[PDB]
Design a protein around this nucleic acid. Structure first.
Ligand SMILES: Cn1c2ccccc2c2c1cc(C#N)c(=O)n2-c1ccc([N+](=O)[O-])cc1
Ligand SMILES: OC[C@H]1O[C@@](CO)(O[C@H]2O[C@H](CO)[C@@H](O)[C@H](O)[C@H]2O)[C@@H](O)[C@@H]1O
Ligand SMILES: [N+]
Lengths: 553, 415
DNA sequence: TAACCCCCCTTCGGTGCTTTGCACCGAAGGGGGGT
């Protein structure tokens, strides 16, 4: 005698009616095997037959279980999903083995036929109607409606998942000494009890589920490590990911690299040093998934270095709340950053990488701050606290940055680790004009129609230059003018401009840019010894600003 | 046995659907304990995923407070909730509160937990408590009473509030009392010792209703000591070309605020093409212009005043060395107030804590002066602010904000 | 020939000020993973 699960009220979107889509042409191979399952569900109580008074319908079909002789049945409720009320998902994230505390006894079991053990809403079962062709639609055919949560309905995951929590709620309160990680129907159970009391605790829970109609088939009951859980392998003192499949195909399409880079990201959670910059660079462009891509020299070298990391097996450890969390970051170049999170040296809880390039112009300090932020949020999710950081940047470098930057920025408690390449600021702008340094009044202009322009400067010593430019913009000529002044000045120079655009970029001390021109300006700034940038308003009759504006306009 | 005040949303607007953000261990444990006690006491009830609404929740510790407090980010719900001024449940603002020598802020939100809430509106107060490492899916709740931090709670409770304060107000006719969100502002011109005494009077006066996070805390303000930060022009005896260029640029920016400012005679000093460090003396015409511009910066702007129907906007600039400037306005370049903060908590070590402090200081001043909280333009990168601001938040309300990046070309608000 | 969830890389269009160019950023759509 099972206990009935209270149904969850489900509605359609206001002013909308059930789905009426009828059926797609079905091959006889599928039409046959389906009718066998229809009767099985009717006998088992999963489905009801009566549907002549039901004007709604949703297509049905089936395909093969992954590399199995069995046919998998699924309903395309995409039309009903549009008409179904919106749900708030209670699944907020994916649990991670690096967050598991070591438990003396562990068990992993699943619920048999989860969706089909949860009663659908009494009033809503009518909208799940579906029709199967008897024999190629020769005869009307058998119609059915779901009495339980069907696969493919946007509300099934949230409803089952929440029902699972109410069922587990009493057991956990009456057994606080146990830890249960519930992910859908997959359950992780661990305790420091003796294996005997553990199997007793397991059977108390295993019966607690059957009372509410939830079976626990021994086909999915794991009692001996390594436990297969969430795509990992759980050993008593270590964990690792289930083996990864690296495509070795010698002819790479667009979709080949997408699948390739995808698996490398998944591997980067424990395999240190994974890089996907050059491989993903091949993917940039609105090219179809079928186009074959020749691997560049760097993209081929990056893939080789990844094989060197993945050829060797790596393991992760478990979390110890008594010890502090340590996060260490290393610079990999080209805006790539890798990190490791650990509590004791060389026994990593997990690893990761940050390679996001945000903004056309940036520097290593900004990217390091962003890597720290990603790690921080990731750590609060898995462990609920912020780790201590070991960063390849000197305290002096960071202080100079955050104290001078006009935007508020901060890094949590951290210490410097001398692990080249170090992060540094490649140049620093003066705060006051340099005495005895030539003053370049720069300016630029571009004809909006012809796209032609000029860039140049005039100096206090009578030095002048004007340069013609083709296929340019006002903004580009303003940067070009500054570049000219840096090229044509000594190691110390004062530069006066009215380009708010140019000053905003340069004052942020970028060390890398998507703009060829900005990178050339950076190259000049790194060579200088003193550079004072000053802004003045345009068209106000100021100094050489009015003079150079004439030359270039 | 108390009937519930019906509340609707603004027509044509759905409910709040804001995802819960990750919480630290200490914040989740404090929430579980708090929500456990609130469920026992009937103030909240668990719900399922059939409720499509959600509002972020987290916890704070107020200034010099060691116990956790629960805070719900009802910003999305407050914007979607019907304005109670149109329902005529709006609370007027006393222009004399900012004039009192001392103002104490009392957390009275705890009293909201006694009034029931409109049943049809309870589904909009849904929130989700997360778990570390996603061990358990989200645990969802909803409110059965007036929730703290909701803009309708002080409006619905206003009728009960005026009753409880009637004895205190009529025995002390000079003390001003203003209610905003879960806080009560009580200002007086009395002596500090007598002010704190009359505050304790109102505390036990509040017990005489609660007898028929907690009430005990109180923070003292002094709005009569609040000053403004005016635009200042340096005074030099000798000026370099760079000095006059900076001056001309600053005055050109300032002319958008003060229309009477002129820079013609000062620009002529920059006619040639000179080295930035060259000292050049002022012409007789330029000396009058500089002095005249300072006068114009001494007087207030013409036709700038507070419009109750317009929203308040606050801009903040990081000036370095723990200095932070801000301006409050409703129309661009028509500033209602300009100010500067310095030596706040976190100065010289933590930019986010200083900015969080500045946001709270400025909001408090806007509530006292206009009874409105401003929408903030924050000088910070979105991800940086979102990663840290809850670690330093110490108020029971949360203002609206957006993220700006304005490089300082001219030092306008701070020399 | 699909349901929900987390992540990364790319493109792209919407937004605003650096203006009718250029940059910031969130939504998708690709991929990886989980049930
Ligand atoms: C590829 N795949 C899967 C792959 C592995 C496991 C489940 C699914 C799956 C799917 C796909 C769907 C769909 N639609 C689906 O509903 N499920 C599913 C998930 C959980 C349960 N249950 O807990 O009972 C039922 C169906
Ligand atoms: O609201 C969405 C999302 O944006 C953030 C970013 O800081 O800011 C908003 O937060 C409020 C909801 O909590 C919005 O109502 C408000 O308009 C805005 O400040 C986050 O706070 C929020 O998660
Ligand atoms: N110009």
């Amino acid at each position: 005698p099972i206990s009935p699960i209270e149904t969850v009220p489900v509605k359609l979107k206001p002013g909308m009616d059930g789905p009426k889509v009828k059926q797609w042409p079905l091959t006889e191979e599928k039409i046959k095997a389906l009718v066998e399952i229809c009767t099985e569900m009717e006998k088992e109580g999963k489905i009801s037959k009566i549907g002549p008074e039901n004007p709604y319908n949703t297509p049905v079909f089936a395909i093969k279980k992954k590399d199995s002789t069995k046919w998998r049945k699924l309903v395309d409720f995409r039309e009903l999903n549009k008409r179904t009320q919106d749900f708030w998902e209670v699944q907020l994230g994916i649990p991670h083995p690096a967050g598991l505390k070591k438990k003396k006894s562990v068990t992993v079991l699943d619920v048999g036929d989860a969706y089909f053990s949860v009663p659908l809403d009494e009033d809503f079962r009518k909208y799940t109607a579906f029709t199967i062709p008897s024999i190629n639609n020769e005869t009307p055919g058998i119609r059915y409606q779901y009495n339980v949560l069907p696969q493919g309905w946007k509300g099934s995951p949230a409803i089952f998942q929440s029902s699972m929590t109410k069922i587990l709620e009493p057991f956990k309160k009456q057994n606080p000494d146990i830890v249960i990680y519930q992910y859908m129907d997959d359950l992780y159970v661990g305790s420091d009890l003796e294996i005997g009391q553990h199997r007793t605790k397991i059977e108390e829970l295993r019966q607690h589920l059957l009372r509410w109609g939830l079976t626990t088939p021994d086909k999915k009951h794991q009692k001996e490590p390594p436990f297969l859980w969430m795509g990992y392998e759980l050993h008593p003192d270590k964990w690792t990911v289930q083996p990864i499949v690296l495509p070795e195909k010698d002819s790479w399409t667009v979709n080949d690299i997408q699948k390739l880079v995808g698996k490398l990201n998944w591997a980067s959670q424990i395999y240190p040093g994974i890089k996907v910059r050059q491989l993903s660079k091949l993917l940039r462009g609105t090219k179809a998934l079928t186009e074959v891509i020749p691997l560049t020299e760097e993209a081929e070298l990056e893939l080789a270095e990844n094989r060197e990391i993945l050829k060797e097996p790596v393991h992760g450890v478990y979390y110890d709340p008594s010890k502090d969390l340590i996060a260490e970051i290393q610079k990999q170049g080209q805006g790539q950053w890798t990190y490791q999170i650990y509590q004791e040296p060389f026994k990593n809880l997990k690893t990761g990488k940050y390679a996001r390039m945000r903004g056309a112009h940036t520097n290593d300090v900004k990217q390091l701050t962003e890597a720290v932020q990603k790690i921080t949020t990731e750590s609060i999710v898995i462990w609920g606290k912020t780790p201590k950081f070991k960063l390849p940047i000197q305290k002096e470098t960071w202080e100079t940055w955050w104290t001078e930057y006009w935007q508020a920025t901060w890094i949590p408690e951290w210490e410097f680790v001398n692990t080249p390449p170090l992060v540094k600021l490649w140049y620093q702008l003066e705060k006051e004009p340099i005495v005895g340094a030539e003053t370049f009044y720069v300016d630029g202009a571009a004809n909006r129609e012809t796209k032609l322009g000029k860039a140049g400067y005039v100096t206090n010593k009578g030095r002048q230059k004007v340069v013609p430019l083709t296929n340019t913009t006002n903004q580009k000529t303003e940067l070009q003018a500054i570049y000219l002044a840096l090229q044509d000045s000594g190691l110390e120079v004062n530069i006066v401009t009215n380009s708010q655009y140019a000053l905003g970029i340069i004052q942020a001390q970028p060390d890398k840019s998507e703009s060829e021109l900005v990178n050339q300006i950076i190259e000049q700034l790194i060579k200088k010894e003193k550079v004072y940038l000053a802004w003045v308003p345009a068209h106000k009759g100021i100094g050489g600003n009015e003079q150079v504006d004439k030359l270039v306009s | 046995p108390i009937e519930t005040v019906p509340v609707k949303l603004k027509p044509g607007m759905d409910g709040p659907k804001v995802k819960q953000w990750p919480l630290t261990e200490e914040k989740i444990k404090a929430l579980v304990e708090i929500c456990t006690e609130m469920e026992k006491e009937g103030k909240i009830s668990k719900i399922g995923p059939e409720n499509p609404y959600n509002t972020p929740v987290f916890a704070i510790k107020k200034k010099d407070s060691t116990k956790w407090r629960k805070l719900v980010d009802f910003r999305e719900l407050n914007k979607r909730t019907q304005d109670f001024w149109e329902v005529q449940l709006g609370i007027p603002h006393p222009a004399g509160l900012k004039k009192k020598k001392s103002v104490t802020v009392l957390d009275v939100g705890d009293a909201y937990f006694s009034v029931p809430l409109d049943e049809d509106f309870r589904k909009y107060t849904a929130f989700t408590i997360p778990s570390i490492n996603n061990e358990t899916p989200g645990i969802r709740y909803q409110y059965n009473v007036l929730p703290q931090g909701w803009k309708g709670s002080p409006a619905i409770f206003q009728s009960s509030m005026t009753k409880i304060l009637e004895p205190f107000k009529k025995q002390n006719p000079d003390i001003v009392i203003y209610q905003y969100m879960d806080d009560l502002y009580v200002g007086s011109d009395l002596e500090i010792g007598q002010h704190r005494t009359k505050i304790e009077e109102l505390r036990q006066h509040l017990l005489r209703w609660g007898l028929t996070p907690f009430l005990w805390m109180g923070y003292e303000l002094h709005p009569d000591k609040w000053t403004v930060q005016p635009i200042v022009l340096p005074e030099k005896d000798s000026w370099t070309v760079n000095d006059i260029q900076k001056l001309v640029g600053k005055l050109n920016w300032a002319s958008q605020i003060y229309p009477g400012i002129k820079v013609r005679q000062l620009s002529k000093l920059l006619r040639g093409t000179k080295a930035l460090t060259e000292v050049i003396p002022l012409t007789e015409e330029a000396e009058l212009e500089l002095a005249e511009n300072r006068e114009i910066l001494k007087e207030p702007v013409h036709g700038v005043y507070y419009d109750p129907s317009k929203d308040l906007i606050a801009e903040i600039q990081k000036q370095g060395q723990g200095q932070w400037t801000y301006q409050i306005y409703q129309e661009p370049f028509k500033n209602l107030k300009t100010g500067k903060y310095a030596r706040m908590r976190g100065a010289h070590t933590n930019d986010v804590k200083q900015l969080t402090e500045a946001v709270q200081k400025i909001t408090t001043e806007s509530i006292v002066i206009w009874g409105k909280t401003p929408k903030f333009k924050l000088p910070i990168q979105k991800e940086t602010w979102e990663t840290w601001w809850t670690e330093y938040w110490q108020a029971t309300w949360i203002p609206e904000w957006e993220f700006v990046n304005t490089p300082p070309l001219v030092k306008l608000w701070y020399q």
